[PDB]
């Protein structure tokens, strides 16, 4: 099964949409309206060419300045890789805790050893009592 293909396609589409939104703010690259060439109306048509930015300029910037972080979070959550494929140091953790018990085990044996000595040190002591 190939589900990562759909994720890569979605990420590429999000990137293309972000690029197009960042490029969609150059519609006035051909002129700056130095004159009033509005033959129909100059009060409500020519003057309102930039006064309607809510439906012309601010209508694309809203979604255009929102897809970036959303797509970033979607890519980081839908694909939260966690796939070192070897778990490099994770197994080492085992090895680590291995030592944690290993020496501990030895310590216990050491304890036993000491205890054993103490054991013997009392056994003869048990002989002395002539009850």
């Amino acid at each position: 099964q190939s589900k990562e293909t759909l994720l890569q396609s979605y990420n590429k589409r999000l990137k293309d949409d972000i690029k197009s939104i960042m490029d969609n703010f150059t519609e006035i690259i051909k002129t700056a309206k130095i004159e009033d060439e509005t033959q129909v109306s100059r009060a409500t048509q020519g003057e309102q060419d930039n006064y309607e930015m809510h439906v012309r300029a601010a209508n694309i910037v809203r979604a255009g300045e929102s897809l970036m972080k959303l797509v970033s979070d979607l890519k980081q959550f839908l694909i939260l890789n966690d796939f070192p494929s070897v778990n490099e140091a994770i197994d080492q953790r085992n090895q680590q805790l291995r030592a944690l018990q290993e020496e501990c085990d030895r310590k216990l044996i050491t304890l036993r050893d000491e205890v054993s000595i103490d054991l013997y040190e009392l056994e003869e002591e048990y002989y002395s009592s002539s009850s």
Binding site: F25, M53, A58, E65, S66, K69, Q76, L80, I90
Partner: protein, 279 residues
């Protein structure tokens, strides 16, 4: 230009100012700070819906499957993790008493189910719940294995067995029936304490299970890849007796303990001899 600048400033304030919590100092945030922790620490990623690496000992269990409904949740508080969702607790205890008939009384753990360490030292509480669930599933598995004794070899050791009670009489001096409980059914005398039958017996019984798993899990590698058992394949080079052929495998479970504990109390008899000396 002023409107575009205001919109971009609002966007920048929404993005780079409300999400800069963990960028300056690592604070309470499940986003990119908690999930990967438990991931790298316990299991791997998997997608049924959002279920990734349930702790069920499926690596070597081969007894029964169980999934894991693990999912993050939100709550208004300070220093709160995801708190992903048997669900109870268990306790292993053996008592070598005199005898007991088929009766019922204030026996197994009462409302004070399994008094255990408070665990005041700082540790992930969700991880504590997870390891407790793993423990109770291990108890379920070991009890399911131990229950398989009625259909086992019924010779030289007669024994009655019911749910949660496996009371047995190897010798007419000691008692048996290691038990377990479920410390989940609780919203809010002088018989519990007995002779020395405590932690340093049952640990062997517990370890025996994972040891039997391990023994019948090592790579074969006999010569290249016949894919067999070490002793089984190495048998050929030597004309082993039928005794050794049988000794390639062996029995397990209760039988082992059936001897072990008995052996223990046998030493106890010798112990009497010591003080009997004084007598």
């Amino acid at each position: 230009l002023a409107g575009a600048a205001q919109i971009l400033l609002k966007g920048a304030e929404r993005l780079t100012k409300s999400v800069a919590e963990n960028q300056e100092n690592k604070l309470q945030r499940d986003f990119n700070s908690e999930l990967l922790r438990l991931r790298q620490h316990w299991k791997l990623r998997k997608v049924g819906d959002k279920i990734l690496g349930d702790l069920s000992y499926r690596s070597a269990g081969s007894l029964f499957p169980h999934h894991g409904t693990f999912e993050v949740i939100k709550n208004t508080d300070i220093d709160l993790d995801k708190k992903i969702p048997l669900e109870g607790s268990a306790y292993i205890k053996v008592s070598i008493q005199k005898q007991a008939p088929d009766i019922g009384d204030l026996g197994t753990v009462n409302l004070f189910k399994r008094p255990l360490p408070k665990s005041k030292p700082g540790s992930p509480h969700w991880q504590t719940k997870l390891e407790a669930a793993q423990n109770v599933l291990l108890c379920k598995e070991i009890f399911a294995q131990l229950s398989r004794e009625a259909v086992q070899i019924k010779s030289q050791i007669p024994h009655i067995v019911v749910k949660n009670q496996i009371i047995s009489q190897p010798f007419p001096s000691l008692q048996l029936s290691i038990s377990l409980c479920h410390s989940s059914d609780d919203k809010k005398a002088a018989e519990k304490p007995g002779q020395e039958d405590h932690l340093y017996v049952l640990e062997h019984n517990l370890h025996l299970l994972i040891r039997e798993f391990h023994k019948q899990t090592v790579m074969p590698h006999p010569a290249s890849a016949p894919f067999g058992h070490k002793r089984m394949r190495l048998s050929g080079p030597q004309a082993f007796d039928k005794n050794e052929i049988n000794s390639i495998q062996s029995t397990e479970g209760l039988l082992e303990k059936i001897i072990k504990q008995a052996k223990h109390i046998f030493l106890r008899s010798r112990t009497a001899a010591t003080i009997d000396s004084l007598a």
